Amino acid sequence: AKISQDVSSSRSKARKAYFTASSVERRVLLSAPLSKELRQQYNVKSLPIRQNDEVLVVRGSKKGSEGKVNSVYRLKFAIQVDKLQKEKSNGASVPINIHPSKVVITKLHLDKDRKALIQRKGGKAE
RNA sequence: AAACUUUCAACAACGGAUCUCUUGGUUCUCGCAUCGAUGAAGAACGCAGCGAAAUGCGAUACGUAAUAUGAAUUGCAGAUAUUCGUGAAUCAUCGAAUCUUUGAACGCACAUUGCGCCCUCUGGUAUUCCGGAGGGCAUGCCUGUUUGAGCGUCGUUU
Numbered sequence: 001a002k003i004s005q006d007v008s009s010s011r012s013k014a015r016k017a018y019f020t021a022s023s024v025e026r027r028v029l030l031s032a033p034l035s036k037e038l039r040q041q042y043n044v045k046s047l048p049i050r051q052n053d054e055v056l057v058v059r060g061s062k063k064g065s066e067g068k069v070n071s072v073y074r075l076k077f078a079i080q081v082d083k084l085q086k087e088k089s090n091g092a093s094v095p096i097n098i099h100p101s102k103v104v105i106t107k108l109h110l111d112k113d114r115k116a117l118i119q120r121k122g123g124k125a126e
Numbered sequence: 127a128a129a130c131u132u133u134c135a136a137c138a139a140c141g142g143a144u145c146u147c148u149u150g151g152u153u154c155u156c157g158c159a160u161c162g163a164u165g166a167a168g169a170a171c172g173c174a175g176c177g178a179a180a181u182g183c184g185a186u187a188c189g190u191a192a193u194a195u196g197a198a199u200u201g202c203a204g205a206u207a208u209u210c211g212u213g214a215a216u217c218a219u220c221g222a223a224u225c226u227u228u229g230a231a232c233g234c235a236c237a238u239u240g241c242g243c244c245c246u247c248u249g250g251u252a253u254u255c256c257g258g259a260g261g262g263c264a265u266g267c268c269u270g271u272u273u274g275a276g277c278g279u280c281g282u283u284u
């Protein structure tokens with residue numbers, strides 16, 4: 001149960017804050033858990049998904065698929081994986097949208113800011 | 127006997143009830159004190175690579191600066207855009223700016239994009255005319271400055 005007077009248990013307020021979330025807020029909302037191998041490598045359990053991460057799909061019809069994130073399509077609350085494509089009868093392929101909470105990050109795209117973020121969260125980066 | 131009329135059932139119509147939802151409303155409580163001549167509230171007209179509206183903004187026009195953050199935006203397109211970084215996106219934050227024509231609305235006027243005057247600079251052979259750029263000119267009242275008015279009145283000299 002929540003104790004703080006600054007926390008709201010309102011369903012309408014919580015949903016409004018989600019669907020009207022800014023792009024910067026949606027980066028944190030689109031977090032993904034790390035795989036077991038990366039969790040012991042970095043001592044961090046989840047990170048906001050980023051463009052050049054590699055993920056393994058763990059839920060849905062594409063469970064077991066792997067690929068590199070192509071875009072964190074923050075407007076649709078989804079990520080698009082490298083070769084997770086649906087082929088229309090037209091012959092054209094549209095990417096399949098997957099929520100980041102339904103994948104595990106298997107390889108991180110690292111830069112000076114990701115490492116500081118991992119070290120900020122108590123982990124180890126380099 | 128058909129057709130026709132009426133009733134019922136099945137399927138299809140017409141229509142949008144019912145059910146289930148809900149970024150809305152309503153009411154209660156808690157906390158706070160912050161509009162404007164330093165130009166408000168409001169109005170009009172504009173502004174996007176491709177927009178009519180809503181939203182945002184003002185010729186720096188769906189925004190400029192700054193701080194933070196840290197890879198997007200996305201319907202399509204596109205960098206003389208970006209990725210171990212003064213660096214994508216961001217009304218995230220916001221302390222610097224821009225802020226058209228107006229509006230208490232202030233040169234005068236306004237059913238007009240009407241008409242002046244002053245200062246500096248500038249173009250046309252120009253203190254005077256015509257053009258342009260920038261800066262100014264409302265009213266009531268207060269304090270002060272300067273210039274004044276009145277046999278209202280004080281001193282002095284014929």
Ligand SMILES: [Mg+2]
Nearest residue numbers: 144145146147
């Ligand atoms: Mg209902």
Ligand SMILES: [Mg+2]
Nearest residue numbers: 236237238240
């Ligand atoms: Mg007239």
